[PDB]
């Protein structure tokens with residue numbers, strides 16, 4: 047009956063919008079935020095309705111803590127949304143290697159390894175409900191232009207994870223992703239001529255997590271990028 | 280305010296389910312059906328709520344008639360759903376050429392040319408509302424196995440249409456598709472271990488047509504195929 | 513021992529270059545040309561070294577005639593290169609339907625149906641040698657920008673053919689394609705900053721037809737487009 | 746005039762075959778090998794014809810040393826072939842996190858970060874010749890089945906690198922990849938019904954490095970996998 051979602055990167059941007067949208071859609075929600083300042087925002091907005099955890103998604107025990115607190119408060123987990131991520135600011139391959147190397151470590155630890163980490167930590171509990179995973183990918187999973195080679199590689203790697211994990215975990219667990227692009231969060235033409243606000247981007251996540259609307263969907267990546275995967279207009 | 284959708288292939292299968300789902304979601308709906316028998320089914324079910332047209336989607340004037348009757352009854356058109364299609368029954372390339380040739384003509388006239396035809400006929404009116412197109416593609420747009428070379432080629436061609444038309448018609452008109460697979464309609468393992476009923480497949484169409492949920496989506500193809508694009512399990 | 517290739521679209525452009533390159537590489541070559549004027553060019557250049565056929569690739573018996581004359585002169589067929597094709601001159605979807613319809617018929621009859629036709633006609637003989645097919649696709653098989661929706665759809669359909677036929681005809685017959693773009697033949701930026709001459713584009717065909725270099729390749733599409741599939745620079 | 750290639754992973758498998766094939770094709774060749782035992786094999790085979798370096802590709806200075814010794818012996822560098830890589834032995838996402846984490850670090854440091862590292866180290870010198878990069882990707886860059894989620898993700902990330910770097914470094918430097926699959930090196934059906942020996946796989950690298958055959962190719966990935974990207978037969 048009652049559905050439960052856990053969301054990383056939930057202190058801002060799309061993550062924060064997923065918290066609102068999933069709460070409005072009736073879910074019980076847990077959230078991982080980065081710091082105290084983001085924690086205060088959600089406490090004030092949702093009072094004690096949520097289960098909140100502050101920590102670094104690069105730390106496995108923080109991910110296990112998120113799962114553990116979700117189960118203890120709501121009793122089970124139906125969907126894990128791995129969404130925390132970071133940009134590379136168009137870092138050029140001609141830069142000093144040590145600068146590339148340090149950035150690579152951070153991009154790949156947050157945008158890829160941490161997804162493995164949260165999925166590992168969520169897996170036992172999703173197996174008990176035949177739940178699902180949704181990963182935030184990127185237009186840069188499909189097309190060039192919206193990042194440097196480290197960012198694009200990291201997001202291509204997410205696509206790999208989606209296909210590989212969807213295949214290995216079927217039939218019990220669905221694994222899908224969403225590929226947003228050109229939406230302001232904290233320059234973006236896009237063929238549809240505008241940049242999306244984070245709220246304008248959340249519906250694909252709801253579909254992929256929904257047990258009714260999404261029961262037949264796995265391995266799938268839904269672009270919501272104003273046409274940017276097609277090229278400059 | 281009031282939204283209006285026009286659906287081909289609406290007498291059966293996914294098309295019929297789109298008629299129900301879009302009516303339940305509040306749309307005014309027009310429908311193209313193939314024959315008298317399908318027309319009687321929808322008259323009995325929806326009484327006079329719909330605008331219905333009987334004819335061959337391979338005939339342009341039938342497509343223009345559908346648009347014309349939609350406008351006259353509801354005043355405008357917000358979304359065209361090109362969905363009529365036919366299968367090739369795994370026709371082998373080793374068969375007599377005249378057999379391949381006759382089948383090719385039919386598959387490509389219905390699965391591709393007719394989509395061009397309906398979009399041409401719907402275009403003036405979608406331009407007046409900044410509406411959208413949703414096309415029914417197929418798992419065979421992405422992967423082999425689910426048809427002969429004629430079917431697969433025809434569905435790859437639909438993908439081409441989606442990308443090409445999404446790019447040309449932006450920013451006013453969004454153009455997207457849905458790629459169902461392994462759902463019974465009138466053998467299908469699929470990694471999720473079951474065949475979907477047509478009702479289980481409709482939510483992606485609603486998202487892509489929705490002006491709120493879908494305003495930032497074009498060029499996109501949403502697989503809903505139980506994982507079949509990933510391969511046999 | 514002695515290898516034999518048959519090439520359509522061989523009177524000009526890439527086709528003509530394939531005739532030269534494959535002759536220089538030691539193949540016996542048959543060629544389908546469109547008209548008398550192209551026939552005179554190859555007779556003068558190659559004297560009687562080739563087997564030449566004038567006709568419309570849209571006519572099955574012309575394709576069977578090409579195969580039949582190849583076998584009778586050289587005794588067997590090792591590779592069929594389906595290359596004849598036509599452009600759509602960026603025809604807009606907003607044009608009068610009858611104009612779109614007439615153009616669609618021609619683009620799809622030449623760029624798709626004729627490939628089915630030549631493959632059907634070549635198939636018996638390739639099965640006797642475990643030979644191969646190479647199809648000319650296009651950058652427009654992968655990306656928008658280089659044609660109207662009819663051209664792009666037709667070339668996406670070729671990709672479908674490659675995957676579908678490669679899978680059905682394995683293990684005996686390999687089926688591959690080449691996707692050229694931005695090369696002058698009878699405007700093209702391309703990230704590599706120049707337009708290729710037809711001779712600069714032929715090496716991928718030689719690899720895919722070569723029994724030594726290509727024995728492990730099927731289902732494959734080789735872009736040779738100066739980076740154009742990646743987007744405008 | 747005289748062409749110079751530098752190859753990592755050159756002590757075995759495809760790398761070793763690339764050393765032979767490129768030497769037979771007239772190139773001057775440098776090679777990075779892992780250990781003393783591989784170094785002895787190439788010294789005995791090629792005597793002092795090559796420039797050889799022993800070290801870990803995960804160490805930047807080893808990569809710079811390879812470049813530096815290439816230039817000092819041959820004077821310039823025309824092509825860098827990043828080929829060193831490692832498999833994940835189908836490691837399951839259900840395994841203990843610390844086991845996944847340790848393996849992830851190694852797969853991604855060798856299969857991705859080291860490619861960034863060698864390209865950074867080769868870049869100054871390729872810019873002086875308008876040279877090229879070829880990366881070894883994998884069937885797992887495109888399809889599931891041939892590895893665990895870490896391997897597949899790492900190889901999807903390589904594809905990202907190819908597209909991203911091809912776009913950023915055009916027009917001076919071409920960047921391409923090769924995606925082998927199902928070839929024994931130190932179980933593999935493949936639709937073509939056999940596993941390739943490493944020698945059977947080298948021709949695509951020669952084409953992508955060749956200044957004549959490959960001058961118009963960048964952003965491209967050439968599968969040579971016996972059809973495995975298409976699915977089980």
Ligand SMILES: NC(=O)c1ccc[n+]([C@@H]2O[C@H](COP(=O)([O-])OP(=O)(O)OC[C@H]3O[C@@H](n4cnc5c(N)ncnc54)[C@H](O)[C@@H]3O)[C@@H](O)[C@H]2O)c1
Nearest residue numbers: 055058059060080102103130131184226227228229231232
């Ligand atoms: N908005 C776009 O245009 C766009 C485009 C492509 C991809 N994305 C992806 O969407 C996802 C969410 O992006 P957003 O737009 O909401 O960006 P954002 O600027 O709001 O930041 C992402 C969120 O992840 C958090 N985060 C970063 N590092 C963390 C860490 N080590 N531990 C815990 N949390 C951490 C951040 O504090 C923040 O809450 C990302 O994966 C991003 O790569 C966004």
Ligand SMILES: NC(=O)c1ccc[n+]([C@@H]2O[C@H](COP(=O)([O-])OP(=O)(O)OC[C@H]3O[C@@H](n4cnc5c(N)ncnc54)[C@H](O)[C@@H]3O)[C@@H](O)[C@H]2O)c1
Nearest residue numbers: 288291292293313335336363364417459460461462464465
């Ligand atoms: N159900 C699946 O497994 C699956 C898989 C891949 C693709 N598809 C695609 O979904 C779309 C709808 O399929 P469905 O599953 O509901 O199949 P269906 O068996 O119900 O038949 C398709 C509909 O299109 C109609 N139609 C056929 N030819 C027509 C014509 N010339 N003029 C007017 N109408 C015509 C049919 O009468 C029917 O109503 C098709 O394009 C199909 O290619 C379905």
Ligand SMILES: NC(=O)c1ccc[n+]([C@@H]2O[C@H](COP(=O)([O-])OP(=O)(O)OC[C@H]3O[C@@H](n4cnc5c(N)ncnc54)[C@H](O)[C@@H]3O)[C@@H](O)[C@H]2O)c1
Nearest residue numbers: 521524525526546568569596597650692693694695697698
């Ligand atoms: N050159 C490029 O930039 C480019 C880009 C994308 C795709 N292509 C494709 O390459 C292939 C060959 O193209 P090209 O560049 O050499 O062009 P081209 O201008 O030389 O013409 C193609 C060849 O096919 C022949 N042909 C056309 N219709 C025919 C028919 N009905 N019957 C028999 N022959 C017919 C033509 O006479 C000509 O010889 C085509 O399929 C084309 O779609 C080329």
Ligand SMILES: NC(=O)c1ccc[n+]([C@@H]2O[C@H](COP(=O)([O-])OP(=O)(O)OC[C@H]3O[C@@H](n4cnc5c(N)ncnc54)[C@H](O)[C@@H]3O)[C@@H](O)[C@H]2O)c1
Nearest residue numbers: 754757758759779801802829830883925926927928930931
């Ligand atoms: N052969 C296949 O079926 C297949 C399939 C997919 C991908 N690949 C890829 O091809 C590339 C080469 O593979 P192979 O088939 O020749 O395999 P291989 O078993 O011969 O080993 C790869 C080579 O890279 C070397 N290497 C590993 N770690 C190294 C390190 N840290 N520092 C320096 N060298 C190191 C190894 O010593 C070896 O020489 C790899 O990237 C692999 O991922 C191969």
Ligand SMILES: Oc1cccc(-c2ccccc2)c1O
Nearest residue numbers: 131132133184192230231232
């Ligand atoms: O793709 C992206 C992912 C995450 C953050 C940003 C961003 C953050 C601050 C300012 C501008 C962009 C971004 O672009």
Ligand SMILES: Oc1cccc(-c2ccccc2)c1O
Nearest residue numbers: 364365366417425463464465
């Ligand atoms: O992909 C498909 C599209 C349309 C119809 C069928 C079908 C129709 C009757 C019986 C079985 C299948 C199908 O498979």
Ligand SMILES: Oc1cccc(-c2ccccc2)c1O
Nearest residue numbers: 597598599650658696697698
């Ligand atoms: O993609 C293409 C395929 C075939 C011909 C042309 C062409 C022919 C004449 C003049 C210009 C272009 C083309 O662009």
Ligand SMILES: Oc1cccc(-c2ccccc2)c1O
Nearest residue numbers: 830831832883891929930931
């Ligand atoms: O994809 C791959 C890449 C590199 C090595 C192997 C391998 C090595 C030893 C034994 C078996 C396989 C492999 O499969």
